[PDB]
Amino acid sequence: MSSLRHAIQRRAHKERAQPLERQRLGILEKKKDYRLRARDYKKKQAVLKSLRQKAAERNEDEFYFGMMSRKGPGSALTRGKGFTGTVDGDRGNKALSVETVRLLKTQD
Amino acid sequence: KPQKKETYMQKRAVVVGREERKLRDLMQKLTTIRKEKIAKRKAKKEAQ
Amino acid sequence: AAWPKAEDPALVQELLDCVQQASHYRQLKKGANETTKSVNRGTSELVILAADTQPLSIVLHIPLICEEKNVPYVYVPSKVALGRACGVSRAVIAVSLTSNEASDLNSKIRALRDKVERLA
Amino acid sequence: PSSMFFEHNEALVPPYNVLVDTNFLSRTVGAKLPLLESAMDCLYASVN
Amino acid sequence: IQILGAEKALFRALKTKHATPKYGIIYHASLVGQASGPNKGKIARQLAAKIAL
Amino acid sequence: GAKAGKKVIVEPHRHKGVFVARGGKEDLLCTANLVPGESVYGEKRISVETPTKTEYRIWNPFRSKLAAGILGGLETIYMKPGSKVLYLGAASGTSVSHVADIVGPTGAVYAVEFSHRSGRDLINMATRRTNVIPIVEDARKPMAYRMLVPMVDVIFADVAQPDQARIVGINARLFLKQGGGLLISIKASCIDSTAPPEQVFASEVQKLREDKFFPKEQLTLEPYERDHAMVSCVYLQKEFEG
Amino acid sequence: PNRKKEQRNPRVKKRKKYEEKQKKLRSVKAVYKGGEGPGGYQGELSGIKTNLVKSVKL
Amino acid sequence: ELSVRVPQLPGPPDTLSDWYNIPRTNLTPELKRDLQLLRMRDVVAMGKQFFKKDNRKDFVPEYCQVGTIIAGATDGVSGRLTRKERKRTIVEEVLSSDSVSKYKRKYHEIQEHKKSGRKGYYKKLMAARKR
Known part of the structure; x- marks a missing residue:
């Protein structure tokens, strides 16, 4: 049980460190750090597998009405060197009319 | 996309004073300490 | 002027005996300003006021705060006897004896303030 | 409630207030047992 | 002369790029008190120019 | 502490007027x-x-004791x-000023005090506030001010008397509307100095229920x-207004 | 096993158990603990919450 | 006697009729700083005084009014802020108070704990490998 064990039965076992001749390579990854690494990789691969399923089973004739108010991801040919697959969003700025810029420049 | 050119509404911004920057820095420090304290309290309550 | 005056038959001496008991128990405030401060801080359970005071307006000003805070007050007829009962070596005209959460004096306090509430 | 120190009711001091249910009352008449006398002999104190 | 007296709001607005006050002491004259709406500010301008002359 | 000159913001409470x-x-x-201004x-x-x-x-x-109860968390006042509001036990008019400031100019606070020098302080503060009327009379005999008190909506009762439930019972039989609110402040050491306070409170609630009230909330205003x-x-x- | 300096004396253990169970009581109910201090009323020193009803609904 | 009337025909309430007309919040940036300070007043007194955890989604109430304590006539020697301490906002009073160094110390401990292993650490590991 738990009362049938001495304090030397309860005593913790210490963890060894990376050798000092090899400490420049980083920390010695043990089971806990390996579990963190494996959890992060399995999570990222699960998201990527779901994205690959969604890109495979895509209707080529789909029509949402946000397509008339968004700029598409395009291709590398149409966009150019600045091509990421992400749809570009708006930063909030807008082209500003001349009367309001006349007001702002009088204030400045 | 992070904008690289500087817009006119960024060029015409008023340089803020010293007292308002001290109040801004104090509000930054208080909000960070509040967020860390809230995360610690929520972790303790989740353990219980 | 002192309408809740204590009468003779073994009520004045019960009051002064409880006063001496509380003064031994260190649960008692002496003098007009200390009675006033104890009533205004609300720790007072009962307050004894002398009635033989040269001009009586002092032990007339204390009953207003006692009636506002609703604590019992009662007049004993001798400030010399009140000072002798407290153990002061001076004449005391106002005595307020406070409340504590654990004592055996509080039974005497409770019976005394029941008799005083019947006197009023 | 006041006078409760961690499932110890300090409000109950003699004379004890005792609520009586119909099952207790039918069985204390059935067992030839006087009600207030047996309650006082159980608690060693004055009940109402 | 249009914004004499409204100098606190004036220099606050000029330093924070807000909109300046339209009038100052001139508001409690007779001739700017008959107008209503934006004609109040227009009459304040015209009255301040005539006051300067 | 809460020093003079500090800036505070003033939001409404859950109650009306507070x-x-x-x-x-x-x-x-x-x-x-x-x-x-006074x-x-x-x-402060x-x-x-x-x-x-x-x-x-x-x-x-x-x-x-009313502000003590509000900070304790009564459901309504x-x-x-x-x-x-008929105030019974209006000793010198300290909390009666705050009750009058709650009920405003269009309400009325009938403040009953028995002692005379407390009556002087009450007449002074009711000279200042024109919606509190002062009544220097014994609250045990409500036939004295039946010309003065019309049928009120709330009774406050801060009397420290052993016959407190009978006093409030006859005052509410004479001057309280059908479904009339009241707040009674019970002091256990003045009701029954020997008995425990929870038993004293239950006995006073039972006496009010015999004197035709329906009790709906109770808090021990302890801190x-x-x-x-x-x-x-x-x-x-069972409901307050109707 | 190794036991505590508190456990070697049965009175001091029952002193520290009472000090921490009187401390756990203040976190549930409200103790009186003296009225207004000598300084007066410095405000309700730890918050006022408006939407909280703490009365025993009879 | 009896005159021609003036014809005066051309949402949420402005003033509360039941609370003696508290005006609606003019949500200035200083009042917004004050309200953020009031929801963070547990952090301001750094553990010396804890507060009732009132955490709604919006900290700005609908009706507020920024006032000032005037005077208690019984206490006026130490319960009274001096002329060099009566400041304009509440945040200015917090900044004029002490323990601003205490806030900065706690902020720098939080900043070390949050820069503990993120990306400067990995830049240092990559440089030590490449050397």
Whole structure:
């Protein structure tokens, strides 16, 4: 049980460190750090597998009405060197009319 | 996309004073300490 | 002027005996300003006021705060006897004896303030 | 409630207030047992 | 002369790029008190120019 | 502490007429001052210059059992602005000023005091506030002020008497509407000095129920006063107004 | 096993158990603990919450 | 006697009728700083004084009014802020108070704990490998 064990039965076992001749390579990854690494990789691969399923089973004739108010991801040919697959969003700025810029420049 | 050119509404911004920057820095420090304290309290309550 | 005056038959001496008991128990405030401060801080359970005071307006000003805070007050007829009962070596005209959460004096306090509430 | 120190009711001091249910009352008449006398002999104190 | 007296709001607005006050002491004259709406500010301008002359 | 000159903001409470002024390190309770620019008993008050005449007055819970009950968390206090309140046990008019400041100019507070010098202080503060009328009479005999008190909506009862339930019973039989709100402040050491306070409170609630009230809330206002309770009850109904 | 300096004395253990169970009581109910101090009323020193009803609904 | 009338025909309430007309919040940036300070007043007194955890989604109430304590007539020697301490906002009073160094110390401990292993650590590991 738990009362049938001495304090030397309860005593913790210490963890060894990376050798000092090899400490420049980083920390010695043990089971806990390996579990963190494996959890992060399995999570990222699960998201990527779901994205690959969604890109495979895509209707080529789909029509949402946000397509008339968004700029598409395009291709590398149409966009150019600045091509990421992400749809570009708006930063909030807008082209500003001349009367309001006349007001702002009088204030400045 | 992070904008690289500087817009006119960024060029015409008023340089803020010293007292308002001290109040801004104090509000930054208080909000960070509040967020860390809230995360610690929520972790303790989740353990219980 | 002192309408809740204590009468003779073994009520004045019960009051002064409880006063001496509380003064031994260190649960008692002496003098007009200390009675006033104890009533205004609300720790007072009962307050004894002398009635033989040269001009009586002092032990007339204390009953207003006692009636506002609703604590019992009662007049004993001798400030010399009140000072002798407290153990002061001076004449005391106002005595307020406070409340504590654990004592055996509080039974005497409770019976005394029941008799005083019947006197009023 | 006041006078409760961690499932110890300090409000109950003699004379004890005792609520009586119909099952207790039918069985204390059935067992030839006087009600207030047996309650006082159980608690060693004055009940109402 | 249009914004004499409204100098606190004036220099606050000029330093924070807000909109300046339209009038100052001139508001409690007779001739700017008959107008209503934006004609109040227009009459304040015209009255301040005539006051300067 | 809550020093003079600190800036506070004043938000409304859950109750009507009461506000809570919070700021910095101390949140306090306040009521809108009826006569602005003057304190009754030397309390801290709160001036706000609206974009002058607006002032709020701080409500001491250690001095007044109603503010002690409000900070304890009563479900309602029955006194909206414009409701008549019969105050029994209006000793010197300290909390009666805050009740009058709650009920406002269109309400009325009938403040009954028995002693005479407390009556002088009450007549002074009711000279200041024109909606509290002072009645120097014994609350045990409500035939004295039946010309003065019309049928009120709320009764406050802060009398420290052993016959407190009978006093409130006859006063509410004479001057309380059908379904009338009242708040009674019970002091266990003055009701029954020998018995435990929870048993004293249950006995007083049972006596009110025999005297035709229906009790709906009860709190022991403990961090402000020892062995005190505040019992809220409705006269002759289950709901408050109708 | 190794036991505590508190456990070697049965009175001091029952002193520290009472000090921490009187401490756990203040976190549930409200103790009186003296009225207003000598300084007066410095405000309700730890918050006022408006939407909280703490009365025993009879 | 009896005159021609003036014809005056051309949402949420402005003033509360039941609370003696508290005006609606003019949500200035200083009042917004004050309200953020009031929801963070547990952090301001750094553990010396804890507060009732009132955490709604919006900290700005609908009706507020920024006022000032005037005077308690019984206490006026130490319960009264001096002329060099009566400041304009509440945040200015917090900044004029002490323990601003205490806030900065706690902020720098949080900043070390949050820069503990994120990306400068990995830049240092990559440089030590490449050397």
